[PDB]
Amino acid sequence: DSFPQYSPKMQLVCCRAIVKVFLALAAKGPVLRNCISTVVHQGLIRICSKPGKWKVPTYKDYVDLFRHLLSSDQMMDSILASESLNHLLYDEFVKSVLKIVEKLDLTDPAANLHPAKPKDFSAFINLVEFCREILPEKQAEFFEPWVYSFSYELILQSTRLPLISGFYKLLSITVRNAKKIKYFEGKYSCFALFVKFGKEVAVKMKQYKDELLASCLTFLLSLPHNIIELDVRAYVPALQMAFKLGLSYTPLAEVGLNALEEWSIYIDRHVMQPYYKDILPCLDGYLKTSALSDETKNNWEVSALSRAAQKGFNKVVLKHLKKTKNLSSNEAISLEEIRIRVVQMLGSLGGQINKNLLTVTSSDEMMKSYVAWDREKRLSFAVPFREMKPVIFLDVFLPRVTELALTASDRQTKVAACELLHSMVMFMLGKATQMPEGGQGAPPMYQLYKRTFPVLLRLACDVDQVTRQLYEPLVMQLIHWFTNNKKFESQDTVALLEAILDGIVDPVDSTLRDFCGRCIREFLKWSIKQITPQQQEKSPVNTKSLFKRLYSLALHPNAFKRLGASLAFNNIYREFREEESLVEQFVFEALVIYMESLALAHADEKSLGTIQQCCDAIDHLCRIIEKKHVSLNKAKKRRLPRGFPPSASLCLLDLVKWLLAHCGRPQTECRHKSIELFYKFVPLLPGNRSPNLWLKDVLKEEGVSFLINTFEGGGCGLLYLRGPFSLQATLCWLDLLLAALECYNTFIGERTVGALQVLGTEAQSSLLKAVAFFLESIAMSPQEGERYNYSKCTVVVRIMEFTTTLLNTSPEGWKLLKKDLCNTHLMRVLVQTLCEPASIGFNIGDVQVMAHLPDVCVNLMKALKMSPYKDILETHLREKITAQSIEELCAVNLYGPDAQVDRSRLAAVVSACKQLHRAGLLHNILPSQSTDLHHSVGTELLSLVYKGIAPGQCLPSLDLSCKQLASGLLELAFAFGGLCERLVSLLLNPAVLSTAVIHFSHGEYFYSLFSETINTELLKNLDLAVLELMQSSVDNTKMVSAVLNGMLDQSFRERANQKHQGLKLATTI
């Protein structure tokens, strides 16, 4: 901690002191080498916590120490006679940073919120800048086996931590250090993690702002993309957003070019060549200043050199010129070096490619650019001199003023152009109604308005503070002036409206897409606040016409084009229902078309956010559908939506029948909202009924052949799926089968319809007949093979949820499904999705599927034990997880180059056995040997892990994945039985080892390694542990003192949920 209270040339002695201490206390064999691991931990929380007059050093003053500790160690132990101390102090830095980040629980302004960890932020952002400076150097072999775990923890932790502004920086750092060394030349494991995380971060960032957009974009573009070139169309608006978001915050305007140079050289030259017409014309705000700027002085004015070199060139200028090298000029980058780099990459881009920066030689727009904005010139300004008063015409200034205000890249002219344009718009607005008349005293100027209005928006939400503060009341005041009574439906409001609309339906604009919604909010408030409400009968600004415009927006096959009808509803849901009489006629005729747009969104994109907005669009309406016509469900004359039959009234009762009729759709996210709305639509009738009375009441009127036409849909009534297919035929059938599988699994999950009532031989459905064929294709172009593997593996979890639903509910009695699905095939698919999931099609990369898999495996394996059949399940699982398989897998060579298979095939068995234990039938599959009450598989595992460390040659080393295996393998062997006296007799051990000095007692190391599973196992059977612990307190007092300390502090630590266990431990000791 006392490094910035020094002077230079003594700090070398300080760093040599700390290196000498760490070298001396490390070379005596591991009993004491585990305080290196906590001293760096302690110093890290010292200096990552710091936010005659002295000062308060923040965090910059130690980065020279932390480079000294491991970079030039060889030029630090030159005098001190050098094995791996740099290695160890890198591994402990990795471990300590993913342990400081392991317990922070971070669930200033960020985004209308501050509900994270009260003050852990300042101890966090210092850590993120500190690792930005210490991390990215020397990414050698020290970092190669650390990318998997460091990536995986941060994915899993930031997935619950969106708006944190800073959990993507460490991923950018590890991917930069992962393409520094090779490692990306498809080991095939982390690649799928990052490929799948690309789309999730792409859809998450679209609703965000400046610091967090910058964070995600510098993550995304730093993906390698010599190798992630597949779907190169997917992220080019994640590149042209960087340049357009350059020009005011340079460190991503750099990385746009630093990406765009490495894409182009190594991506093969046909999948890139269509993608230049849009990348490049953004790169021409970087050629607009010709060095006419003169701000601060461009000479050497007077300094410590400008006097010392005057009186001859003596030795004091040598003293001064050995003093200006160590300034470490590392302040981002200067703008003019970016302009030179723009020109150098534009030159190196090619010859054919190069001429893309302009129009394309007589397109539609080239011969429209030559034309005046409006023909007759208005805005005649008369500049008063003393005696002349001439006339200077405006409007020749406008296509350079409004082009210069947006993209200037020099703020001293940008603020000038902005102030000029605001006064010019004010003069234009005041000119428009003089007093003379209305054709030559008030001449129209909407050919200027139609190009002045799509630029006030792009100014008023641009980046900068000052222009935003200057254009908020203008863009909010002219809405108030336009939407009026005296206005009487002119032609400029229509231009403003279409400008707002194409502000929403526009690409590369996720800061304006919200501001036009705020304009729609102001439209709807002030358009009824002061209008004549008896006259809103014909104008096309009308909320009827706006809603019809929104519905035509709402049903449209252009992806971004329905997003307007999503977002305008999202921004005036707080309106239009706190005023009545206009909900009931069309907006619940719009609930169905909003769900129809959600049906349309079934094939678009993972990375757009259509789904996440349409769901809120239909959920904002289901909090006012349940407060209005509860008291007003009458037979009025109501307007009729899409698909519905004609009537004279549509009170509540045809919607629920349509909801029942289309529960079989292969639209994955409209079916869910359909069912979820139907269940809470079944009440609130006059009578206040229940879903059990209602569905049986309809079946007694219609019969079971009516409620199987809706569920089976079009899915009742194949060798092209021999190899894995990808056609839209096979995928649509798999989607139909999932629809039929999941449409009534919720009905038997509730108690609406009994399983014997609708699956007995009265419906003649092809359901179990089709599922039996479905279970016969399950294990048998690499582009869209994954497109079908995804739906092949989202069906088996619905099958298992279905049987887990049926076999535990009130339909007990399995006499309906004897050999249809409950045969020797579900007990094949369950076995292969329990153990070895990466051979039927389960990808290893995801998170929200591989965290749901052992849950449903255990929920079903508990649902076959109490069943009227268990023999098939036990005598199928008894063929893989036998004890002899554990014995033959427990080989003799688990150290060295057997890095993946021999120490990965064991871990699947370990996790499978853990989930069997969690079901409750570990012993039925694996009973012990004959005599003793200690399981002779657990004793075998315990002796194996105990003998695994003692050499017999130099040192059996460690890893992270040489300890997660050996700490799952050992947590298994305490779950079998009691097995505790063997544990304490292994701890209190006087056997002597040695290492190349001798200093080893074989119980200290085996305690020191794992040390937490051991104590948590000791704490369970507490009362029969302390007696034989304290009994040998004369001959081995050192070890029992250590074990008693190691149990006392761990019992102290979990005082927050087990307070009445430590009391028992105290009263027993």
Binding site: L292, D294, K297, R386, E387, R400, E403, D410, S423
Partner: protein
């Protein structure tokens, strides 16, 4: 010059002195007329900023600064004058617009008071000052050069401005639209040959060879050699159209009158450019150096006086001697010219504002990689400074300016590569250099031959330099890159009709092609493709000569497991020999038999009985050499070419035999209509628009040839993607009626199934009868 001071405060003092009464006046029009006196061409980048600043400073002496909107919904006068001044000081283009509007405002307000006795004198005074501006300026700044030429052409007295400096000013500041409109406005209100010669010199540089036809007639006194020499450079033929310029130059009779001096300099300058567009680096050097002096001119003070010569004879001198330096032998006679020229100031600014890339290439020749660094960073800053100043809506100026950045950064790449030391001991960066240079060509058909010559000669000089410095089989790897650069240069120089350049490029790329097998095939294919492309405009009996000269080499060895192994090399020889025989047989069958008069072995070569076999053998050999290609191409656009030449040649032979009557050629011809329909329907499937419009040829050849080949239509029409007939659907629902409605039936069924909305409206009229 104390107004562009590199220190504020003091600059405010000097401006405060200059803006005072009795040093610069305080009447508005007299202040405007007085502002021209302080021009001083050291400053002109700032001159418009300073002119509008002094002209708008005395705005703040008036009683009119009280609410210039007069109502409640407003703003004050200074809120759009003070930021208007502050934005005019920051950018040139809005400054240009402000000064060019205020100037016209004052001069159109002065016409109330004062008679012509003084306003005519004021306008003649201003005319002399604008001439002085245009004569003295040396750094042609585009929003000033195009500012005075735009306040000129709006007034009636300034129009007679300066037709010989307007041309060379707006030509070198790349603002030719303004000067073209100025001179075409001067030609309105004996003939005026001077302004016509300079206006044609303006149009000659932006292409526009269409509008050099209404200029050079014989009714404005101009000669008859200039029209016939523009009509041979309109088509890119700069080897006769320059050959008759000097034949017009040194002639002695001229019996119509004298060839006036304006036309003499037009002949000189156009002969310079027509020597520039080739690669003759000796005649351009001599014609540019030695039209002022005699017996080894010194050049040293010679060009810098008599100031006509700088804007005309300096660029081609420095370019010709530099390009002759950039390969070959030394002749250190440019370096001393620059070294003696640089002691001045008005020569030290002119030689480094405008050139700097010739300077960098000059100092890299004597291993001064330190001065060259300064000069090339100066050139980059000058490109950026210029490109950001020529206007938005002026295309092709920016394309002609942006076509130089590749040569700039190839210099900058060589500078950063030679001085790093991660190189020059391993050739694993050299391989990356040779594999990134061969994929960075400029585009064919858009980028003219001066730019191709720039890039190729700079690259050959750089490769020779790194072979000099790479003393750590390396002398084959660079020559096998130089070949593939020059070959692409030839294939771009052929497509723009520049044949005299490409012909000597072949003649210089033939001494070492005979030492390999991958080289001779590409050689002979490029040669005999040029010989086909050249024969489109020769009339007759000489194209037979050239396509007979290219016979004895197309049938050489070539199959050293090469033509049998490779497929595209097998396809190209066949299609080119087929087009050769097609050229001969179409040549001597429209003009029958006179062409064997100048013939010794030519007659026997066409014989390889007098007027029947000599056509029949050529047509059947064309059919053989065309039929090899489709079967060698079946195993896009690699099968489409071989298909469509076969379809078009067989259709051509069918329509040639259609207008006559025969039996034997009909017996040969009875295989061709089978070959037409399938080979067109196999290329209509693939997305080809050069064959979709050939559908009524099928729909008529079926009717006229119906005894065979209709199942041959049905089997192919049964599988064609059925939206390639929505154009011809009213052309098929009339063949539905009459006979041979089969092979319409299936496709109409497919369209009525898939898209039952296209055919609904052309079906009612056809079912109506």
């Amino acid at each position: 010059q104390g107004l562009i001071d590199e220190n504020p405060g003091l600059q405010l003092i000097i401006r405060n002195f200059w803006s005072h009464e009795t040093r610069l006046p305080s009447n508005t029009l007299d202040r405007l007329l007085a502002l021209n006196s302080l021009y001083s061409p050291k400053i002109e980048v700032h001159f418009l900023s300073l002119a509008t600043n002094f002209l708008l400073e005395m705005t703040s002496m008036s009683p009119d600064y009280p609410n210039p909107m007069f109502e409640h919904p407003q703003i004050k006068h200074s809120s759009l004058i003070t930021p208007l001044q502050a934005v005019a000081q920051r950018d040139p283009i809005i400054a240009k617009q402000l000064f060019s509007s205020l100037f016209s405002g004052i001069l159109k307000e002065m016409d109330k008071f004062k008679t012509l006795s003084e306003k005519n004198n004021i306008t003649q005074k201003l005319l002399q000052d604008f001439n002085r501006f245009l004569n003295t300026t040396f750094s042609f700044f585009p929003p000033f050069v195009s500012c005075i030429q735009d306040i000129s052409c709006q007034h009636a007295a300034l129009l007679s401005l300066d037709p010989a400096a307007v041309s060379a000013g707006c030509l070198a500041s790349l603002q030719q639209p303004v000067g073209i409109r100025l001179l075409e406005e001067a030609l309105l209100r004996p003939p005026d040959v001077l302004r016509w010669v300079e206006l044609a010199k303006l149009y000659r540089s932006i292409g526009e060879y269409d509008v050099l036809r209404g200029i050079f007639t014989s009714e404005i006194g101009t000669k008859q050699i200039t029209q016939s020499a523009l009509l041979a450079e309109a088509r890119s033929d700069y080897s006769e159209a320059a050959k008759q310029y000097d034949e017009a130059l040194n002639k002695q009779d001229w019996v119509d009158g004298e060839p006036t001096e304006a036309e003499k300099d037009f002949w000189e300058l156009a002969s310079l450019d027509c020597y520039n567009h080739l690669a003759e680096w000796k005649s351009l050097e001599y014609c540019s150096t030695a039209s002022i002096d005699s017996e080894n001119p010194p050049d040293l003070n010679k060009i810098w006086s008599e100031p006509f010569y700088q804007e005309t004879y300096l660029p081609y001198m420095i370019r010709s001697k530099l390009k002759l330096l950039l390969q070959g032998e030394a002749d250190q006679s440019l370096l001393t010219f620059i070294d003696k020229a640089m002691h001045g100031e008005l020569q030290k600014a002119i030689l480094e504002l405008h050139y700097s890339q010739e300077l960098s290439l000059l100092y890299l020749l004597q291993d001064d990689v330190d001065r060259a660094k300064y000069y090339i960073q100066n050139g980059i800053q000058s490109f950026m400074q210029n490109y950001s100043s020529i206007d938005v809506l002026l295309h092709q100026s920016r394309l002609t300016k942006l076509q130089s950045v590749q040569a700039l950064t190839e210099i900058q790449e060589f500078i950063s590569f030679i001085s790093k030391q991660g190189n020059l001991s391993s050739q694993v960066p050299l391989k990356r250099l040779l594999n990134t240079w061969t994929n960075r060509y400029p585009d064919a058909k858009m980028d003219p031959m001066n730019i191709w010559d720039d890039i190729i000669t700079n690259r050959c000089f750089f490769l020779s330099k790194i072979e000099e410095k790479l003393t750590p089989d390396i002398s084959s790897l660079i020559r096998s890159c130089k070949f593939s650069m020059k070959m692409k240069m030839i294939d771009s120089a052929r497509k723009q009709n520049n044949f005299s350049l490409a012909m000597k490029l072949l003649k210089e790329l033939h001494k070492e092609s005979k030492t390999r097998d991958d080289w001779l095939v590409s050689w002979v294919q490029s040669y005999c493709r040029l010989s086909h492309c050249r024969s489109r405009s020769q009339g007759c009996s000489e194209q037979v000569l050239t396509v007979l000269k290219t016979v004895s080499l197309l049938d050489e060895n070539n199959v050293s497991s090469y033509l049998s192994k490779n497929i595209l090399a097998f396809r190209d020889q066949n299609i080119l020999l087929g087009t050769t025989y097609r050229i001969i047989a179409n040549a001597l069958s429209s003009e029958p038999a006179c062409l064997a008069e100048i013939e010794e072995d030519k007659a026997r070569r066409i014989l390889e009985e007098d007027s029947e076999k000599v056509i029949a053998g050529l047509y059947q050999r064309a059919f053989q050499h065309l039929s090899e290609a489709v079967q060698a191409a079946e195993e896009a656009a690699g099968v489409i070419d071989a298909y469509m030449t076969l379809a078009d040649f067989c259709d051509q032979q069918l329509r040639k035999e259609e207008e006559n009557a025969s039996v034997i050629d009909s017996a040969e011809l009875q295989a061709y209509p089978a070959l037409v329909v399938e080979k067109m329907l196999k290329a209509l499937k693939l997305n080809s628009n050069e064959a979709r419009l050939k559908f009524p040829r099928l729909l008529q050849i079926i009717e006229r040839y119906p005894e065979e080949t209709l199942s041959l239509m049905t089997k192919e029409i049964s599988s064609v993607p059925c939206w390639q007939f929505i154009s011809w659907i009213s052309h098929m629902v009339a063949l539905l009626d009459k006979d041979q409605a089969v092979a319409v039936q299936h496709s109409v069924e497919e369209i009525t199934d898939n898209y039952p909305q296209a055919i609904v409206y052309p079906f009612i009229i056809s079912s109506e009868s």
